Amino acid sequence: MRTRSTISTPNGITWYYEQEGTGPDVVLVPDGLGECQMFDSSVSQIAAQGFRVTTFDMPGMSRSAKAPPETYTEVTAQKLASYVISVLDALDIKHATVWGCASGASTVVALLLGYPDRIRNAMCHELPTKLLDHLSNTAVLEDEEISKILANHMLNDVSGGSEAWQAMGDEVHARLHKNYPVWARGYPRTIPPSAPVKDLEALRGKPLDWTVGAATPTESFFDNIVTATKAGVNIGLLPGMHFPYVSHPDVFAKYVVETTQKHL
Amino acid sequence: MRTRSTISTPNGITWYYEQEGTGPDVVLVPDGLGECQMFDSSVSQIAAQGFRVTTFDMPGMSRSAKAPPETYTEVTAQKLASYVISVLDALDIKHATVWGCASGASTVVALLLGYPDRIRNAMCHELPTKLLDHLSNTAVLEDEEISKILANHMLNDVSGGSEAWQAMGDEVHARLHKNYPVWARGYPRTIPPSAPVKDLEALRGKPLDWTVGAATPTESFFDNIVTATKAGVNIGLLPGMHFPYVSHPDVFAKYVVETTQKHL
Ligand SMILES: C[C@H]1CCC[C@@H](O)CCC/C=C/c2cc(O)cc(O)c2C(=O)O1
Numbered sequence: 216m217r218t219r220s221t222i223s224t225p226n227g228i229t230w231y232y233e234q235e236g237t238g239p240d241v242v243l244v245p246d247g248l249g250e251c252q253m254f255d256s257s258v259s260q261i262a263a264q265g266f267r268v269t270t271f272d273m274p275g276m277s278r279s280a281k282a283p284p285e286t287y288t289e290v291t292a293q294k295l296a297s298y299v300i301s302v303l304d305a306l307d308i309k310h311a312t313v314w315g316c317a318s319g320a321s322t323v324v325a326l327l328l329g330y331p332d333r334i335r336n337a338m339c340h341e342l343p344t345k346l347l348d349h350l351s352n353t354a355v356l357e358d359e360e361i362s363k364i365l366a367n368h369m370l371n372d373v374s375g376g377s378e379a380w381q382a383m384g385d386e387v388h389a390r391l392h393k394n395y396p397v398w399a400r401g402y403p404r405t406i407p408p409s410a411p412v413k414d415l416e417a418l419r420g421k422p423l424d425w426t427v428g429a430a431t432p433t434e435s436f437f438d439n440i441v442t443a444t445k446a447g448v449n450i451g452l453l454p455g456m457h458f459p460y461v462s463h464p465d466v467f468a469k470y471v472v473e474t475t476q477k478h479l
Numbered sequence: 480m481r482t483r484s485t486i487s488t489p490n491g492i493t494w495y496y497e498q499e500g501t502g503p504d505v506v507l508v509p510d511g512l513g514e515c516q517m518f519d520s521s522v523s524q525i526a527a528q529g530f531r532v533t534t535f536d537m538p539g540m541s542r543s544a545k546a547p548p549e550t551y552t553e554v555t556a557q558k559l560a561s562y563v564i565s566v567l568d569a570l571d572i573k574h575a576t577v578w579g580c581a582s583g584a585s586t587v588v589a590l591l592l593g594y595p596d597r598i599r600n601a602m603c604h605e606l607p608t609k610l611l612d613h614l615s616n617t618a619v620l621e622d623e624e625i626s627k628i629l630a631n632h633m634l635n636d637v638s639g640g641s642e643a644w645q646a647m648g649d650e651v652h653a654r655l656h657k658n659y660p661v662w663a664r665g666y667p668r669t670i671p672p673s674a675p676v677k678d679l680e681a682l683r684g685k686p687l688d689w690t691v692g693a694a695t696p697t698e699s700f701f702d703n704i705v706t707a708t709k710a711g712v713n714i715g716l717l718p719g720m721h722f723p724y725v726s727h728p729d730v731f732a733k734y735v736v737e738t739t740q741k742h743l
């Protein structure tokens with residue numbers, strides 16, 4: 216049985232969150248699009264292995280749109296981490312395993328480094344350390360041009376699985392539609408330079424498990440593989456690209472449970 | 480002005496080879512398809528920066544087909560390295576910079592490790608260390624089914640640049656046509672286990688520059704990036720996939736000259 220609900224935190228944000236299962240806490244942090252329905256079926260798979268899984272739309276996105284501006288503009292890993300800690304403090308989640316892709320990856324590494332007592336282990340996927348002008352330059356467009364470009368780009372190029380992507384349904388795509396512009400203005404100039412992956416030695420020996428998309432062109436996250444390997448951090452692949460939880464839910468879910476079981 | 484000619488070596492092979500320019504010796508080893516016309520425009524670009532560039536069709540391939548069976552069956556990095564040292568002995572090339580992709584890559588690191596006095600520096604691109612069953616399984620097909628599958632796969636998927644690939648013209652494709660089956664039977668079962676990258680400390684300090692294709696899916700040569708980074712070996716990207724010398728000749732040529740200039 217899944218809890219769908221809202222909870223507010225004292226940084227002015229009102230989160231939409233979902234939660235299923237009983238057991239140690241596993242937290243699924245979204246990618247930059249901030250949309251926790253992407254996790255829907257995996258929240259169930261993971262929970263069925265004896266975990267309490269929590270997830271939530273991110274600030275300014277989807278149903279967590281009631282949030283002050285600082286929370287979705289000039290977004291950094293360190294800002295996102297403190298926001299996620301706040302929603303963990305409100306839900307009374309003390310010790311959590313965390314997953315995140317893209318800005319979620321940057322977020323979970325910042326969580327692991329900043330709050331080591333709170334984080335049992337962190338799985339980061341495709342952490343973005345580089346400025347990409349093709350993304351950054353969308354920010355100057357008209358809102359509705361941004362949605363068209365970005366929606367089309369997710370569907371045709373980088374979903375990892377276009378059928379799975381489309382099957383999320385009209386409601387999700389209508390929420391994503393509104394998110395694309397806020398993401399485009401808030402995230403890609405300031406997320407990469409916040410990457411908390413420049414201090415190698417802070418990573419060494421930490422409970423961190425890094426992945427990258429198997430179908431993703433080698434250039435996009437080449438740097439993650441170098442960095443993980445220099446730091447001694449476990450690094451491997453998942454199928455698909457940026458959204459293994461949409462394209463390959465079963466393998467995703469299994470990966471999260473297995474990795475969590477390593478650290479209990 | 481370019482020399483186009485043949486020379487025979489005492490291991491039974493008669494090589495077709497081309498050679499242009501004056502300067503330090505740069506040697507372009509083909510990928511598995513064995514076809515040195517892929518390097519045409521680059522042989523000129525590199526030479527024009529003051530090098531003597533040599534290239535050649537590989538044994539059993541294209542115009543170097545007059546060769547005994549051991550030279551194109553159960554092919555190995557160590558065999559290919561022996562064969563190229565022979566054609567370098569016959570052409571009186573004593574010190575050479577070498578490039579090679581795929582089986583060429585394996586060949587040039589075997590060359591660097593086995594004949595250190597002969598090799599000024601080696602550039603390896605996408606060195607294959609894994610058995611792939613989809614390639615290995617083509618070997619049991621009818622010759623002409625192998626050509627159709629592999630030619631289609633190069634043109635549609637994996638060329639890095641489909642226009643450039645097709646622009647090599649009818650003669651080269653009619654030679655590749657005959658090579659595909661020889662390659663399929665000779666190379667993919669035995670090249671990966673010969674990968675001379677299992678001794679990390681043999682690679683450390685060596686004059687080796689490793690690249691991978693930028694557009695190539697991350698899974699294919701994930702392992703190269705790990706292995707390079709563990710060995711302290713310089714590792715970067717080129718544009719396209721397995722054939723940067725076809726898809727991106729200008730940036731390929733510049734990369735070979737620039738890297739060679741680092742080691743004079
Ligand atoms: C929302 C996803 C979209 C992936 C598109 C994908 O094709 C582009 C992948 C590289 C960029 C990801 C990204 C980079 C940033 O600087 C900040 C981010 O929040 C993201 C990120 O979350 O990317």
Ligand SMILES: C[C@H]1CCC[C@@H](O)CCC/C=C/c2cc(O)cc(O)c2C(=O)O1
Pocket residue numbers: 510511512580581582583607609614637666667668670671699721
């Ligand atoms: C000729 C290219 C095939 C390109 C398809 C290419 O997309 C196939 C994936 C990479 C494999 C390359 C390869 C693997 C081997 O075990 C032996 C080889 O000689 C090659 C090789 O040279 O690869």
